[PDB]
Design a binder for this molecule. Structure first.
Ligand code: MG
Ligand code: MG
Ligand code: MG
Ligand code: MG
Ligand code: MG
Ligand code: MG
Ligand code: MG
Ligand code: MG
Ligand code: MG
Ligand code: ZN
Lengths: 94, 114, 244, 60, 91, 69
RNA sequence: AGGGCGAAGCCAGAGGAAACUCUGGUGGAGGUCCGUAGCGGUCCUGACGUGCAAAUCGGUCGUCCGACCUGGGUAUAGGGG
RNA sequence: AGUGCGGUAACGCGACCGAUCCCGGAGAAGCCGGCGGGAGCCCCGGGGAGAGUUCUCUUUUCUUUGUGAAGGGCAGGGCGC
RNA sequence: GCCCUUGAAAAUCCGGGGGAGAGGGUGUAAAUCUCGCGCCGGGCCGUACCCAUAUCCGCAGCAGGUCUCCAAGGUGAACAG
């Protein structure tokens, strides 16, 4: 499961939550992975999906809706897009 | 106190018969009849509830008088559509066409395979 | 004596329908090559309220396939429709909700509404609010389909004639009590002059056949022929059985 | 003559139980009295915060 | 039960209309005024606009739903059946 | 009406074909110069008195120069 | 007009192991109450009763955000509306 | 070469070619509550000009004390930019 | 906030997408949903006064009826008296 591996990333690794910030992380070429909630707007997703394709970056569609993902980042707010810059000691990146 | 009367034969207080008080140089409070409140145009997108920027919200039969620059804005879809909905239309219309090309490529490979 | 309230509703006049603010008819798209052979795609531009109607409607806009021109329709909203959704329709339409396709295509047990009673009629059966029909069974030759209507009846139908998949939106309206007479008044005012209704027992015997008496009673049987001249046909018409 | 009497009303006069006809809430509406208070105390709080007297979390 | 023991929303109606009706209204009267979650953004803003039509204020997604609930049960059960049959047809 | 800010500009407006009366209001502390045209009544505020007295001479062919009192 | 009652939602504090409950606020619901204009028209079986009036007057009354009141336009005509 | 240019951008600048065709907007929206801003009026403290009172008291009490539209500037509101 | 109430049409006016066309050939052109200025025109009918305890309708200068706008000080919850 992905929730478990994220937990560790959020604890120990470096990361960034949200679309304005993750698109800046990909555009820098630092972002190693991009998680998308399922409810994300369709235009947004396809835009991000293209940005990863240009930057040769992983894109993982999360199983849950943006409330679940934010819950799954350990935040009381809700996150639709999340980039993983440096995982701490997790194998979120395979 | 100076009470006052309407200045036109329309007695009834209506959408048409709206007023305001004004002190003249003669030093008498007088009714002036007021012009209706114009609205800025809403977006062609139709989801963005907020009305458009950089347009003189004025009663539509005035627009006639106004200069072109007042009536619009320097952009593609200028003064017809909000920016956000343009820069989403743009990248949408682009990203869509890139996938149409990808499906065309996957179709052509499948023809060459078969 | 008098022409009774009831006979009078036929002359229209006061008892005609109130239709200023009504947003239009709630049809289906008309058939054409695209509908007939493939599937035309349109988008749901908005969902609307239509006075005197419990079902909400849906401005659905297509592209006319002959003139450069964006034609638009008023579908009755299938429940779970929303804006910025696409609404495909035709023979080769995908069997998902808010998607109008011929009854002959769609499998058995398939729930539909705004279902064409006769091919090309533009959507006549099951278009109320919480209502729908179910496609029972197909006869491939004869090109006919059996459909179970909300009344219970199991009507036979041409397999060509279309329907929107899914039930009608705004269901369970009638679970809420009205309470206030006022609330009744406000319902029928956006419809037609049919409300505060006076019982024929109340009336003098010139304006209704139950009228008169020293006691508010009917006096004759309240069941009645339907070979009955208009003016008597009052109470329970052709009532097969009458009680609880 | 009025002006003189209004000056009496300032001193706190002709204002006892037996010269009131309206309810207390009519005379000074409780809502308005509340509105004043919030608009005071809140104004005091955000002045304190914006002088670094009190921190974010205290303020809240 | 701060202000009322057992009327809540239907305390507006006062004594009127009878106990059963007012109890019967309390169910709907609650649900219809409820703010639901917009399964589109995920904010709690789905609010009935008029009968059978619910609007997210943020999402701006108007959504044909039930008369007093964003979803009827009927609609939900119909949805799943259609999805099942769709899969049965195409494979 | 229209206020003007350059002594030259008012001189150019006064020199048009459409113009006529160029009345002059000594307000004390101000000395305006109101020159009527077809459409607008142009005015020009000239705070100095000697500069106003100088301009007085600089209007051209025999216009009204109907000084106001 | 102006008042009264103070429904949902919201805040804090206190208790509760939880479920949740109490206390103080805020909030302003309603074919809600009082009560003006308005609309009406209970009683005095008052006045008047060759009247002011071919139905009026006085006090007293009902209602006063709603099946509210109301101008103009428009529809329905005689065994018909 | 030349169917204007500025701003990261919201957008800006006095003008800035253009048909049938198409899309959109404005015209074009219920009632009720609360709160806020702007005026008119009222109020208060004073300046003046004219009044009335003055047996005693009263720096008195009373009146009056202005700037149209249209432009330009600037507050002051608002913004789901 | 309320609605099993969701609360006008059209004339007219503008914006945008498109890009069929048009412009002159190195001092000018076509172009100004033209910017600033300049010139000429805007016909037809209504326009007195009353608008109500005396200009209206109730046979009358009839205690009846008849749609609106403006709306000072004091007392007072108050457009109550
Ligand atoms: Mg008019
Ligand atoms: Mg502009
Ligand atoms: Mg009777
Ligand atoms: Mg009979
Ligand atoms: Mg009597
Ligand atoms: Mg007598
Ligand atoms: Mg008399
Ligand atoms: Mg006159
Ligand atoms: Mg009068
Ligand atoms: Zn938009």
């Amino acid at each position: 499961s992905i929730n478990s591996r994220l937990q560790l990333v959020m604890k120990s690794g470096k990361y960034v939550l949200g679309y304005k910030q993750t698109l800046k992380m990909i555009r820098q070429g630092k972002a190693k992975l991009v998680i998308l909630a399922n409810n994300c707007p369709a235009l947004r997703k396809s835009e991000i999906e293209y940005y990863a394709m240009l930057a040769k970056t992983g894109v993982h569609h999360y199983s849950g809706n943006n409330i679940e993902l934010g819950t799954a980042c350990g935040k009381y707010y809700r996150v639709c897009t999340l980039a993983i810059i440096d995982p701490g000691d997790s194998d979120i990146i395979r | 106190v100076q009470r006052l009367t309407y200045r036109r034969r329309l007695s009834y207080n209506t959408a048409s018969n709206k007023t305001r008080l004004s002190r003249t140089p003669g030093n008498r409070i007088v009714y002036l009849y007021t012009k209706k409140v114009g609205k800025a145009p809403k977006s062609a997108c139709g989801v963005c509830p907020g009305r458009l920027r950089g347009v003189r919200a004025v009663r539509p039969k005035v627009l006639m008088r106004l200069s072109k620059t007042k009536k619009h804005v320097s952009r593609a879809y200028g003064g017809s559509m909000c920016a956000k909905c343009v820069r989403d239309r743009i990248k949408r219309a682009f990203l869509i066409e890139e996938q149409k090309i990808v499906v065309k490529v996957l179709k052509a490979q499948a023809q060459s395979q078969k | 004596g008098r022409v009774i309230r009831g006979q009078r509703k036929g002359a229209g006049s006061v008892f005609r329908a109130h239709v200023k603010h009504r947003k239009g008819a709630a049809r289906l798209r008309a058939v054409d090559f695209a509908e007939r052979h493939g599937y035309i795609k349109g988008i749901v531009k908005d969902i609307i309220h239509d006075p005197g109607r419990g079902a909400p409607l849906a401005k659905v806009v297509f592209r006319d396939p002959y003139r450069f021109k964006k034609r638009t329709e008023l579908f009755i909203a299938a429940e779970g429709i929303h804006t910025g959704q696409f609404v495909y329709c035709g023979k080769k339409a995908q069997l998902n909700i808010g998607n109008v396709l011929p009854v002959g295509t769609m499998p058995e047990g398939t729930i539909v509404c705004c279902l064409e009673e006769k091919p090309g009629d533009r959507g006549k059966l099951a278009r109320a609010s919480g209502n729908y029909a179910t496609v029972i069974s197909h006869n491939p030759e004869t090109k006919k389909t059996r459909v179970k209507l909300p009344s219970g009846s199991k009507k036979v139908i041409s397999s060509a004639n279309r329907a929107v998949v899914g039930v009608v939106a705004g269901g369970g309206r009638i679970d809420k009590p009205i309470l206030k007479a006022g609330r009744a008044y406000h319902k029928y005012k956006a419809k037609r002059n049919c409300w505060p209704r006076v019982r024929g027992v109340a009336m003098n015997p010139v304006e209704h056949p139950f009228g008169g008496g020293n006691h508010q009673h009917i006096g004759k049987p309240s069941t009645i022929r339907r070979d009955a001249p208009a003016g008597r046909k009052v109470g329970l018409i052709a009532a097969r059985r009458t009680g609880r | 003559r009025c002006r003189k009497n209004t000056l009496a009303r300032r001193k706190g006069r002709h204002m006892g139980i037996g010269k009131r006809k309206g309810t207390a809430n009519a005379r000074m509406p409780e809502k308005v009295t509340w509105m004043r208070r919030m608009r005071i105390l809140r104004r005091l709080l955000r002045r304190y915060r914006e002088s670094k007297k009190i921190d974010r979390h205290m303020y809240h | 039960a701060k202000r009322t023991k057992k009327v809540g929303i239907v305390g507006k109606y006062g004594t009127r209309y009878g106990a059963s009706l007012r109890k019967m209204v309390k169910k709907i009267e609650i649900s219809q005024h409820a703010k639901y979650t917009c399964s589109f953004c995920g904010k709690t803003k789905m609010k009935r606009r008029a009968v059978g039509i619910w609007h997210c204020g943020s999402c701006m997604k108007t959504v044909a739903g039930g008369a007093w609930t964003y979803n009827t049960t009927s609609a939900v059960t119909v949805k799943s059946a259609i999805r099942r049959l769709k899969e049965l047809k195409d494979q | 009406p229209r206020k003007i800010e350059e002594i030259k500009d008012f001189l150019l407006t006064a020199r048009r074909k459409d113009a006529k009366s160029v009345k002059i209001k000594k307000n004390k502390d101000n000395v305006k110069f109101k020159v009527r045209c077809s459409r607008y009544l142009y005015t020009l505020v000239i705070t100095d008195k000697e500069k106003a007295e100088k301009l007085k001479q600089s209007l051209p062919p025999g216009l009204a120069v109907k000084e106001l009192k």
